[PDB]
Amino acid sequence: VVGGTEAQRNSWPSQISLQYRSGSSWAHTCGGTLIRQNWVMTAAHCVDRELTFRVVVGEHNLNQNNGTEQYVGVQKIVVHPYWNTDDVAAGYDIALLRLAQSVTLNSYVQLGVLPRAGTILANNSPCYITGWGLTRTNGQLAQTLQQAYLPTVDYAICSSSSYWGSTVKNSMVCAGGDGVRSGCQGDSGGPLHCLVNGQYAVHGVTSFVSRLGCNVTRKPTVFTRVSAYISWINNVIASN
Ligand SMILES: *C(=O)c1c(Cl)cccc1NC(=O)[C@@H](NC(=O)OC(C)(C)C)C(C)C
Ligand SMILES: [Ca+2]
Numbered sequence: 412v413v414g415g416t417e418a419q420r421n422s423w424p425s426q427i428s429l430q431y432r433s434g435s436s437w438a439h440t441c442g443g444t445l446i447r448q449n450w451v452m453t454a455a456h457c458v459d460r461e462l463t464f465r466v467v468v469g470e471h472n473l474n475q476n477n478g479t480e481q482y483v484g485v486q487k488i489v490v491h492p493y494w495n496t497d498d499v500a501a502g503y504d505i506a507l508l509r510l511a512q513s514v515t516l517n518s519y520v521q522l523g524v525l526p527r528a529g530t531i532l533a534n535n536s537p538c539y540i541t542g543w544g545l546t547r548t549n550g551q552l553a554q555t556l557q558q559a560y561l562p563t564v565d566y567a568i569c570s571s572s573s574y575w576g577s578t579v580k581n582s583m584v585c586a587g588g589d590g591v592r593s594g595c596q597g598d599s600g601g602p603l604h605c606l607v608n609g610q611y612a613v614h615g616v617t618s619f620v621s622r623l624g625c626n627v628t629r630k631p632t633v634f635t636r637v638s639a640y641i642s643w644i645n646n647v648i649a650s651n
Contacts (some may be wrong), residue, residue, distance in 0.1 A: 412542050413626045414592035415557030420471050420479075423541050425523030425613065426556060427451055428470045429600055432463040439473055439552060442542045442601020444523040444613050448513040450648060452523070453600035454616055454635065455494035455506045464488075466510055469519040473543055474554045479519040484511030489647050491640075502582045504618040504635045506600075507647050523602060523613040526638040530607075532614065534565035538586050538605035540617065540632060544597020548624040552597050561587035561594075561603070564631050574629050582639040584615045585631035594632035595625035603634050613637060 429441035429451075441457035443466065451466055458464065469479035487509040494503040514520055532538075541558045545551060569575055569585035579585060586603055587593050594601075594617045603615025615634030621627045637644075 412540055412544060412553065412557040412559045412593070412598055413547060413595050415546065415553070415559040418541060418556045418558040420477075421518050423556065423558065423602070423604065424469075424519050424521040426470070426541055426602065428467040428473065428543060429453055429457055430465050430467060431460075437465060439543055439597065441597070441599050442544070442617060443508070444602045444616070445514065445520065446523050446525065447648065448516065448522070449510050451508040451510060452616060452637070452644070453506050453508060454504045454618055455490045456499060456504055456618070457600040458488050458490065458506050458508070459496055464508070466508065468514050470556070472555050473552070481514050481520065483514060485509070486511045487651065489651065491643065499619050500578050502580045502635065505616055505640055507644065509651060524610060525641060525644070526612050526614055528638060528641040530614070530638040532563050532605060532607070534563060534568065536563040536605055538563055538603050538614065540586065540594050540598065540601070540603055540615075542594065542598030542601045542617065544599070545595040545625065548595065548626065559592040561592055561632060563605070564588055569631060574631070575633065579633060582636050583618070584634040584636045586615065586634065588629050588631035590626055590628035593626040594620055
């Protein structure tokens with residue numbers, strides 16, 4: 412997150428870190444949302460490589476023992492059947508990870524609340540992006556979970572030429588674009604938390620930014636609109 416602030420330790424407890432076994436270490440690659448004690452929603456792009464993946468729930472500081480962490484194997488990965496690796500702009504940037512164990516819910520580890528199917532937000536809707544990804548374009552990962560206020564930019568504005576044009580579909584959410592605050596490499600797969608009837612719900616899954624750079628004026632961070640996927644999501648869960 413570019414232009415963030417250090418989150419309080421307990422503000423976002425459906426945040427996970429998506430990690431890969433890197434030599435004899437584990438490295439942070441992505442974000443996620445714990446949506447069941449045994450199911451994590453992430454980007455398809457985050458599980459494109461054939462790597463060994465684990466999830467960490469209760470994470471605050473990537474480099475230090477918080478005493479809250481739970482470390483869990485990925486058992487199964489189901490990417491959306493229309494995801495294409497070479498077309499992120501075609502959307503379907505969603506995966507559902509079944510973990511090896513169920514996690515224990517406490518004040519640090521809670522389920523994300525997902526939108527009702529088909530819910531769109533009004534432009535300029537109040538939303539936060541969370542993550543441990545780069546804190547500058549071409550910069551470095553954060554050690555602590557950062558959060559940025561990133562209002563939504565409605566489709567009609569977002570899909571306009573001056574914004575993203577046709578790169579953005581209506582199965583996506585666009586949020587931000589101020590030139591100062593954004594998602595960046597490493598936040599991908601994570602939550603866009605939006606305040607709806609007094610409750611934060613996960614409306615985004617962080618998918619992409621502009622190749623010019625992460626914080627670019629009139630290039631919002633682009634998210635997979637979760638509310639376009641709720642039957643899919645429940646259909647995977649019911650059946651696996
Ligand atoms: C998200 O996929 C993403 C965004 Cl939101 C903007 C720019 C690039 C990417 N790429 C990624 O996040 C890649 N992850 C990555 O580089 O993770 C770190 C920085 C931790 C090494 C994915 C392809 C995994
Ligand atoms: Ca830690």
